[PDB]
Amino acid sequence: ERPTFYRQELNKTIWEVPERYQNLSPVSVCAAFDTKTGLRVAVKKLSRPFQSIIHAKRTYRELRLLKHMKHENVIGLLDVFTPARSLEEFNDVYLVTHLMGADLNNIVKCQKLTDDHVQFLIYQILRGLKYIHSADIIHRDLKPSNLAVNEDCELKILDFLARHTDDEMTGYVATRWYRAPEIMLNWMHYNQTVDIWSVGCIMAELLTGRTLFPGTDHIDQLKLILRLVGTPGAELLKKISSESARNYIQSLTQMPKMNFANVFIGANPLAVDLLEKMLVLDSDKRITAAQALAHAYFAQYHDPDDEPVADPYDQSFESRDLLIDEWKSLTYDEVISFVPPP
Ligand SMILES: C[C@@H](CS(C)(=O)=O)Nc1n[nH]c2nc(Oc3ccc(F)cc3F)ncc12
Numbered sequence: 001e002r003p004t005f006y007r008q009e010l011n012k013t014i015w016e017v018p019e020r021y022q023n024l025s026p027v028s029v030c031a032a033f034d035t036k037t038g039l040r041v042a043v044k045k046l047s048r049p050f051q052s053i054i055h056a057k058r059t060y061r062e063l064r065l066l067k068h069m070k071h072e073n074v075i076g077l078l079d080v081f082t083p084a085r086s087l088e089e090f091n092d093v094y095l096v097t098h099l100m101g102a103d104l105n106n107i108v109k110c111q112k113l114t115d116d117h118v119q120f121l122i123y124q125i126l127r128g129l130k131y132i133h134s135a136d137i138i139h140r141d142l143k144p145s146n147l148a149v150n151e152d153c154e155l156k157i158l159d160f161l162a163r164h165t166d167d168e169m170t171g172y173v174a175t176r177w178y179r180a181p182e183i184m185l186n187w188m189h190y191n192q193t194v195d196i197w198s199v200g201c202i203m204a205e206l207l208t209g210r211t212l213f214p215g216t217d218h219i220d221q222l223k224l225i226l227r228l229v230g231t232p233g234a235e236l237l238k239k240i241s242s243e244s245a246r247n248y249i250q251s252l253t254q255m256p257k258m259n260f261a262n263v264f265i266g267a268n269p270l271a272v273d274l275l276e277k278m279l280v281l282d283s284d285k286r287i288t289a290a291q292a293l294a295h296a297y298f299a300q301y302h303d304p305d306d307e308p309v310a311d312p313y314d315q316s317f318e319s320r321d322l323l324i325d326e327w328k329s330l331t332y333d334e335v336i337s338f339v340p341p342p
Pocket residue numbers: 027029030042043044066075076077078095096097098099100101102103145147148149
């Protein structure tokens with residue numbers, strides 16, 4: 001049956017939530033206490049979820065994605081609710097997940113982590129990614145700020161969705177530093193391995209305490225990337241479906257791949273080897289999450305029987321054109337059909 005809701009203004013926003021959620025505090029996301037489960041939770045009220053087709057579809061997309069994700073190392077949905085009693089009244093959507101303490105930045109904080117810390121942290125990211133990728137879902141925007149960790153260094157992947165504007169990808173910004181070159185410059189139709197590029201950047205940063213490719217702009221970042229991994233070979237150049245981008249790439253003086261052991265001085269030789277396998281220019285040749293988990297660097301964490309894959313994820317809706325009310329009705333069904341985890 002329908003729980004009792006109570007009203008409360010917070011972010012100059014009127015929040016109407018079930019009584020079970022108490023002590024709401026702005027952190028449009030609020031920290032709260034779930035009296036039913038005893039969990040500290042984050043409650044997110046979507047703003048204008050059905051204002052346009054694009055926005056309505058995005059609301060549907062986020063809910064579908066969150067409802068599907070059932071893995072230790074991936075953000076899960078604890079609850080989803082609306083104060084509405086019917087489709088006609090339906091206008092607001094609230095999403096509930098675990099309140100995560102801090103992100104990966106707060107932990108790195110300009111400092112080198114121990115090799116054991118790096119092992120454990122990257123292991124969990126790859127474990128989550130294997131899961132995510134097995135459902136043919138690409139994160140597309142993995143960075144330290146989308147990786148939440150608790151006191152015990154237990155990690156969850158957040159975000160996934162919305163996507164950054166051209167303005168916020170411009171200049172000296174962490175929003176672009178972990179992005180694979182093929183997606184940063186739209187070289188081609190990208191695949192799941194864009195995320196592996198991002199993991200390599202993250203891992204290097206955990207090892208050195210420094211951003212791997214802190215480009216001041218797209219062009220500066222590419223030069224930083226190509227200095228490390230070398231300029232593309234003929235094989236890759238053919239794969240760059242963009243004639244314009246291909247032509248610019250060929251304007252650059254050729255450079256060989258650097259010695260990673262000389263770049264990551266003092267680092268575990270197994271970490272160096274993994275980095276070389278993640279940070280490959282040609283995305284076809286990048287190591288996958290499943291393959292990376294079997295790499296000797298994770299010997300003390302790897303367990304083939306404790307690295308689950310996801311149930312199939314039906315994302316046919318992505319290529320579907322619908323009206324606002326149709327995306328809305330679909331979103332409503334998803335809210336109403338939600339079943340809480342054990
Ligand atoms: C405060 C923050 C610090 S942090 C980890 O981002 O640095 N911590 C968080 N823990 N959980 C979170 N969730 C969201 O957004 C949601 C996403 C999906 C939902 F179902 C519900 C949400 F509220 N935002 C932040 C956090």
